[PDB]
Amino acid sequence: QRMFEIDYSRDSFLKDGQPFRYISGSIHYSRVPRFYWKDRLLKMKMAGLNAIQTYVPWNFHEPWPGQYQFSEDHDVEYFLRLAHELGLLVILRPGPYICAEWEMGGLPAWLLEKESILLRSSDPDYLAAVDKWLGVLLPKMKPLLYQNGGPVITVQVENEYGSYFACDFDYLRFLQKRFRHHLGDDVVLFTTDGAHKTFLKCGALQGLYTTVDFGTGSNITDAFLSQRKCEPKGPLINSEFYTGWLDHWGQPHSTIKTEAVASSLYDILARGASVNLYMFIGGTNFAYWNGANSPYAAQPTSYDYDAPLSEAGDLTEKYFALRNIIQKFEKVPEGPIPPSTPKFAYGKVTLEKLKTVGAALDILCPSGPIKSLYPLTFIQVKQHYGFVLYRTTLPQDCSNPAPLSSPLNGVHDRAYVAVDGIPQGVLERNNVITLNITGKAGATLDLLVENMGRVNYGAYINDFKGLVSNLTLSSNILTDWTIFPLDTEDAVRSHLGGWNYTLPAFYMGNFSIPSGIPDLPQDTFIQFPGWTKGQVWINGFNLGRYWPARGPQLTLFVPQHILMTSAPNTITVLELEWAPCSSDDPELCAVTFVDRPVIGSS
């Protein structure tokens, strides 16, 4: 009964034998609480989109081999059925690598247990893992295919493989074969690459429909000409038409002008091309889900993207402008659009020190440390995200400053250094590979190492994290390590079992919200004036990383559904560098909730 195909005669899609063109927007279900899925999708539908496009992050669903997460916020099948309910078609991008400014481009860190693994290639062990994953994911997606009564109209294989150095065509052919095994012979499979022959060379494959991506800076004729070299016939497709851009900590917030996005969108649509707006809503990298680029620069917690729907789902002037463009081509749904959420400034909330990381090792590492002659990586100690403590003893007297160094630039990505509980400062990947330290002979040398996000693009996606090479003190290699993987998420859930720099430490405070008020709790934004760099949880939910010292993001988005009115709300901060809490003024040791985000600070 139901069919979706490429017709090579009208340079078109045919949906149930009818000319069809898609106008789609990207929304990542892993970047929006499920509480808000229907809000965002309905806002997208009201804009005149007839489809949405989404990535399936493998590492979001398979945190350990054979251990799966498909419930609640991880319920991709529900997310797709919801889109379908709303009258939206779906362009599925299941990877296995997705890029996406996301931790290791969606690839599970446990792949790195084979240290020599060649990711995104025909490496047999990489293929065997991919095959197992596809064996779990694709039979789920099969009933959601259009032909079987679901919303999924096309499926991307890999993601910009043409940008990767490997150029392993047998890898692409394997994915093609495995996608066909699980999904059948009708589903439209495609690939996406930059709009240039240099990208298309290694990214395009026979039997996979070749599509391009490009933003407002690209000559649209030339871009589609490049697609046409690969596909003389069939629909013109821009799979990621950029509505904005990504950010890095320390760099100015990226924006793209509404007039530019509207102008290019109209041009693309007028050509009869199918198009997807990347991103339509960007949302948030909660917890440790952000990625990074090479040379090492991490993307922030916010994935606002300057998208037409803001981080918290707000209707922007860009939203209305693009809706007006769509309305020139298609009738858009009638009625009022769901509103931007109300925001509430809960105001100042004082915190008090709970414990330093150093004093909390029983709770953070209840299994005990691992001893090693030389340092081990995050992967080797079986921890993928967050923080690992490296401990040794000083082999000599350091009454005069002595150089602590990582000659091979092997602090991945940042270390907070202490000696006998006295903070010495910070080592940084690519920036600070030496720090002068002092302490007595036999003093305890501690390095709290942060994985700031695995690189998600380029050759260096095999990003282990930790002390990945030796440390030297006064030119001598430091040996005899006591390494504590840190169970930060459990420890914060239990209030740490108690159910110029400062030592890394947890600070906690409470605030109440009245019950029986129809419009509370509301969404809010948490700000950290006087703090420096760390992690924040509210009611045990890890909202991400703050870094007001570096910017551009100052505030973090707090969705209302994690806030309660039946018992006090808890806020826990792990501050890594300097806390405003040693002063005699307790009101300084405090966070503030405001009703407007600040993501573009100078």
Ligand X SMILES: *[C@@H]1O[C@H](CO)[C@@H](O)[C@H](O)[C@H]1NC(C)=O
Total residues belonging to the chain: 602
For residue 403, the partner it binds in ligand X, Cl ion, ligand DGJ, none, with Cβ less than 5 to 8 A by kind, is: ligand X
One of 519, 584, 585, 587 touching a copy of itself (CB under 8 A): 519
Side-chain-side CA neighbours of residue 409 (13 Å): 6
Sign of CA dihedral 11, 13, 17, 23: negative
507 contact partners, CB below 8 Å, separation of at least 6: 351, 352, 353, 354, 572, 573, 575, 579, 581, 589
Does 231 belong to an annotated binding site? no
> Does 561 help bind a copy of itself (rule: CB under 8 A)?
yes
Supply the minimum distance, in Å, between the C-beta of residue 316 and a copy of itself.
17
- The separation between the first and the last C-alpha atoms of the chain, rounded to the nearest angstrom, is 56
Minimum distance of a copy of itself from residue 384's CB (angstroms) = 32
Beta-carbon contacts of 526 under 8 Å, excluding residues fewer than 6 positions away, are 536, 538, 543, 546, 555, 556, 558, 571, 591, 592, 593
470 binds ligand X (CB under 6 A): yes
Residues 6+ apart with CB under 8 A from 372: 481, 483
Q: 73 — phi, psi (to 5°)?
A: -70, -15
Rg of the chain on CA atoms, in Å? 25
Query: Per rule CB under 8 A, is residue 514 in the interface with a copy of itself?
Result: yes
Q: Is 107 in the site for ligand DGJ (CB under 6 A)?
A: no
Q: Does 494 bind ligand X (CB under 6 A)?
A: no
Which residue in 59, 154, 159, 176 binds ligand DGJ (CB under 6 A)? 159
Q: Which residues pair with 537 in a beta bridge?
A: 542, 572
- Three-state secondary structure call for residue 31: helix
Can you list the alpha helix ranges (DSSP code H) found in 304-371? 317-327, 361-364
| Nearer residue to a copy of itself within complex by CB, 217 or 518 | 518
User: Considering 240, 311, 450, 575, which one is annotated as catalytic?
Assistant: 240
- The CB density around residue 66, as the number of other CB atoms within 10 Å, is 7
Query: What are phi and psi for residue 39, nearest 5 degrees?
Result: -50, -55
Min dist CB 351 to a copy of itself, Å, is: 16
Catalytic residue among 5, 62, 103, 160: 160
352 catalytic? Reply is no
**Binding pattern to Cl ion, positions 27-66, x when CB under 5 A?**
--------------------------x-x-----------
State in angstroms the smallest separation of the CB of 512 from a copy of itself: 8
What are the helix (H) ranges across 86-168? 124-141
Examine residue 516 and tell whether it contacts a copy of itself (CB under 8 A): yes
- 288 a known binding residue? no
Structure tokens given for 176 = 């093609």
Q: What H or E segment, with its residue span, contains residue 190?
A: strand 188-194
Identify any residues that bridge with 242 across adjacent strands, giving them in sequence order: 278
Residue 99 lies near ligand DGJ (rule: CB under 6 A): yes
231 catalytic residue (yes or no): no
Shortest approach of ligand DGJ to residue 342 CB, angstroms? 30
Residue 26 partner contact from ligand X, ligand DGJ, Cl ion, none using kind-dependent CB cut-offs of 5 to 8 Å? Cl ion
**Residue 26 binds Cl ion (CB under 5 A):** yes
154 lies in the binding site for Cl ion (CB under 5 A)? no
Sheet hosting strand 590-594, strand order edge to edge:
347-350, 590-594, 524-527, 556-558
Does 512 participate in binding a copy of itself (rule CB under 8 A)? yes
462 annotated as ligand-binding: no
Question: With binding defined as CB under 6 A, does residue 270 bind ligand X?
Answer: no
Residue nearest to ligand DGJ (CB): 99
With binding defined as CB under 6 A, does residue 407 bind ligand X?
no
Q: Contact, 590 vs 349, CB < 8 A?
A: yes
Spatial separation of the C-alpha atoms in residues 145 and 84, rounded to whole Å: 11
Regarding 100 and contact with ligand DGJ (CB under 6 A), the answer is yes
400 is in an annotated binding site: no
Binding positions for substrate: 55, 101, 159, 305
Site residues (CB under 5 A) for Cl ion? Answer: 26, 53, 55
- For the annotated binding site, the residues are 55, 101, 159, 305
Residues of the shown chain interacting with ligand DGJ in the complex, contacts defined by CB under 6 A = 98-101, 159-160, 240, 246
- List residues with catalytic annotation: 160, 240
Q: Which residues bind ligand X (CB under 6 A)?
A: 219, 221-222, 374-375, 401, 403, 434-436, 469-470, 477, 510, 567-568, 570
